[PDB]
Design an enzyme around this catalytic site. Structure first.
Site, PDB file in Angstrom:
ATOM      1  CG  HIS A  41      -0.576   0.381   2.455  1.00 42.48           C
ATOM      2  ND1 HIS A  41      -0.258  -0.569   3.404  1.00 42.48           N
ATOM      3  CD2 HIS A  41      -0.449   1.586   3.063  1.00 42.48           C
ATOM      4  CE1 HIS A  41       0.091   0.044   4.529  1.00 42.48           C
ATOM      5  NE2 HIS A  41      -0.015   1.350   4.345  1.00 42.48           N
ATOM      6  CG  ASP A  88      -0.234  -4.018   2.565  1.00 43.86           C
ATOM      7  OD1 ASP A  88       0.319  -3.552   1.548  1.00 43.86           O
ATOM      8  OD2 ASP A  88      -0.609  -3.307   3.524  1.00 43.86           O
ATOM      9  CB  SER A 170       2.400   2.554   5.972  1.00 44.41           C
ATOM     10  OG  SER A 170       1.070   2.905   6.294  1.00 44.41           O
ATOM     11  N   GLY A 171       4.493  -0.099   6.326  1.00 40.90           N
ATOM     12  CA  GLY A 171       5.699  -0.636   5.683  1.00 40.90           C
ATOM     13  C   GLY A 171       6.824  -1.042   6.644  1.00 40.90           C
TER      14      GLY A 171
HETATM   15  C1  LIG Z   1      -4.088   6.288   3.723  1.00 38.64           C
HETATM   16  C2  LIG Z   1      -4.154   5.000   2.935  1.00 38.64           C
HETATM   17  N1  LIG Z   1      -4.006   5.025   1.601  1.00 38.64           N
HETATM   18  O1  LIG Z   1      -4.084   3.702   1.139  1.00 38.64           O
HETATM   19  C3  LIG Z   1      -4.338   2.892   2.224  1.00 38.64           C
HETATM   20  C4  LIG Z   1      -4.509   1.378   2.143  1.00 38.64           C
HETATM   21  C5  LIG Z   1      -4.385   3.680   3.379  1.00 38.64           C
HETATM   22  C6  LIG Z   1      -4.606   3.170   4.698  1.00 38.64           C
HETATM   23  C7  LIG Z   1      -5.839   2.566   5.004  1.00 38.64           C
HETATM   24  C8  LIG Z   1      -6.111   1.980   6.258  1.00 38.64           C
HETATM   25  C9  LIG Z   1      -7.502   1.421   6.473  1.00 38.64           C
HETATM   26  O2  LIG Z   1      -8.329   1.410   5.541  1.00 38.64           O
HETATM   27  N2  LIG Z   1      -7.802   1.042   7.712  1.00 38.64           N
HETATM   28  C10 LIG Z   1      -9.181   0.612   7.986  1.00 38.64           C
HETATM   29  C11 LIG Z   1      -9.538  -0.858   7.825  1.00 38.64           C
HETATM   30  C12 LIG Z   1     -10.855  -1.206   8.154  1.00 38.64           C
HETATM   31  C13 LIG Z   1     -11.274  -2.520   8.058  1.00 38.64           C
HETATM   32  C14 LIG Z   1     -10.374  -3.487   7.638  1.00 38.64           C
HETATM   33  S1  LIG Z   1     -10.849  -5.182   7.516  1.00 38.64           S
HETATM   34  C15 LIG Z   1     -10.219  -5.748   5.965  1.00 38.64           C
HETATM   35  O3  LIG Z   1     -10.174  -5.941   8.611  1.00 38.64           O
HETATM   36  O4  LIG Z   1     -12.332  -5.335   7.612  1.00 38.64           O
HETATM   37  C16 LIG Z   1      -9.068  -3.136   7.301  1.00 38.64           C
HETATM   38  C17 LIG Z   1      -8.643  -1.811   7.387  1.00 38.64           C
HETATM   39  C18 LIG Z   1      -5.153   2.062   7.283  1.00 38.64           C
HETATM   40  O5  LIG Z   1      -5.301   1.607   8.434  1.00 38.64           O
HETATM   41  N3  LIG Z   1      -3.928   2.663   6.988  1.00 38.64           N
HETATM   42  C19 LIG Z   1      -2.966   2.688   8.030  1.00 38.64           C
HETATM   43  C20 LIG Z   1      -3.081   3.607   9.073  1.00 38.64           C
HETATM   44  C21 LIG Z   1      -2.143   3.610  10.112  1.00 38.64           C
HETATM   45  C22 LIG Z   1      -1.087   2.692  10.079  1.00 38.64           C
HETATM   46  C23 LIG Z   1      -1.006   1.783   9.040  1.00 38.64           C
HETATM   47 CL1  LIG Z   1       0.258   0.598   9.035  1.00 38.64          CL
HETATM   48  C24 LIG Z   1      -1.945   1.761   8.022  1.00 38.64           C
HETATM   49  C25 LIG Z   1      -3.646   3.198   5.707  1.00 38.64           C
HETATM   50  C26 LIG Z   1      -2.274   3.822   5.487  1.00 38.64           C
END
Ligand SMILES: Cc1noc(C)c1-c1cc(C(=O)NCc2ccc(S(C)(=O)=O)cc2)c(=O)n(-c2cccc(Cl)c2)c1C
Ligand SMILES: *[C@@H]1O[C@H](CO[C@@H]2O[C@@H](C)[C@@H](O)[C@@H](O)[C@@H]2O)[C@@H](O[C@@H]2O[C@H](CO)[C@@H](O)[C@H](O)[C@H]2NC(C)=O)[C@H](O)[C@H]1NC(C)=O
Ligand SMILES: [Cl-]
Ligand SMILES: [Cl-]
Ligand SMILES: [Cl-]
Length: 215
Positions: A41, A88, A170-171
């Site tokens: 991502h 990812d 992230s990453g």
């Molecule tokens: C901004 C962004 N641009 O592309 C993406 C992917 C994101 C994104 C989306 C998300 C995101 O969409 N989170 C919500 C989410 C909701 C539900 C589910 S699930 C598949 O378990 O139902 C996963 C993620 C996200 O968390 N993060 C994130 C934020 C902080 C730390 C880290 Cl390591 C990642 C990011 C960076």
């Protein structure tokens, strides 16, 4: 990293900052002299030609002669699914090879298929949001959990207070028992909710693939 602490300088010499015109946007892990791995991502929608890979960093606000900087020559993908946030992981091949030294070292990876149990103690780390972007590399004690985590992730939760990874982490690697077991992938409930565990791409599920690319 929300609720962590400053790392000792160069404590984690495999830790990488991915940058665009001098600004950190994602972490990565040095896995061979000419390869890093990060989250898929992180480079979605990004101009990969503009990405700079910064090794041997500690305080990003400072000039640090310990640093080595590379461009990205090629990326290797493994079935990233942005809709379900699965697989990812990306490997970025560098335009040159790191000089391996005290401050710049290759990470050690687990065996293919290794699966961490509830209760494993790990360290998360990164230069991501502190609650803006960190200047000094942050680290954080976390515990592996299976509740509110899919089998296709490794997830962690800090017990008893609100702390966790955040945007810009992230990453970044999750280190457990000396090995890189995770790549920071996503949070739920906002950063440091104290409810949803942080989710990482499970490195051990991808080791044979990594090995085939990096030697
Ligand atoms: C901004 C962004 N641009 O592309 C993406 C992917 C994101 C994104 C989306 C998300 C995101 O969409 N989170 C919500 C989410 C909701 C539900 C589910 S699930 C598949 O378990 O139902 C996963 C993620 C996200 O968390 N993060 C994130 C934020 C902080 C730390 C880290 Cl390591 C990642 C990011 C960076
Ligand atoms: C908080 O985490 C530190 C570091 O975690 C360890 O090292 C990481 C790199 C990773 O491999 C983790 O899985 C490890 O747990 C812990 O530091 C250790 O502390 C003990 C004393 O308790 C000491 O013997 C070790 O040398 C330390 N290891 C290192 C590398 O510094 C610490 O115990 C954790 N604390 C809690 C309460 O979880
Ligand atoms: Cl971009
Ligand atoms: Cl196992
Ligand atoms: Cl959410």
């Amino acid at each position: 990293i929300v609720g962590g602490r400053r790392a000792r300088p160069h404590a984690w010499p495999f830790m990488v900052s991915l940058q665009l015109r001098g600004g950190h946007f994602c972490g990565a892990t040095l896995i061979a002299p000419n390869f890093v791995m990060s989250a898929a991502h992180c480079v979605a929608n990004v101009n990969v030609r503009a990405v700079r890979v910064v090794l041997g960093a500690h305080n990003l606000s400072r000039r640090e002669p310990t640093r080595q900087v590379f461009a990205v020559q090629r990326i290797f993908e493994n079935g990233y699914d942005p809709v379900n946030l699965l697989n990812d992981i990306v490997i970025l091949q560098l335009n040159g090879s790191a000089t391996i030294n005290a401050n710049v070292q290759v990470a050690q990876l687990p065996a293919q298929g290794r699966r961490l149990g509830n209760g494993v103690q790990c360290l998360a780390m990164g230069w991501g949001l502190l609650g803006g972007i960190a200047s000094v590399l942050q680290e954080l004690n976390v515990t592996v959990v299976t509740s509110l985590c899919r089998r296709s992730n490794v997830c962690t939760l800090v017990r008893g207070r609100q702390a966790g990874v955040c945007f810009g982490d992230s990453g970044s690697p999750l280190v457990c028992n000396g090995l890189i077991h995770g790549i920071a992938s996503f949070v739920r409930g906002g950063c440091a909710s104290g409810l949803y565990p942080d989710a990482f791409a499970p490195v051990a599920q991808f080791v044979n693939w990594i090995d085939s690319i990096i030697q």
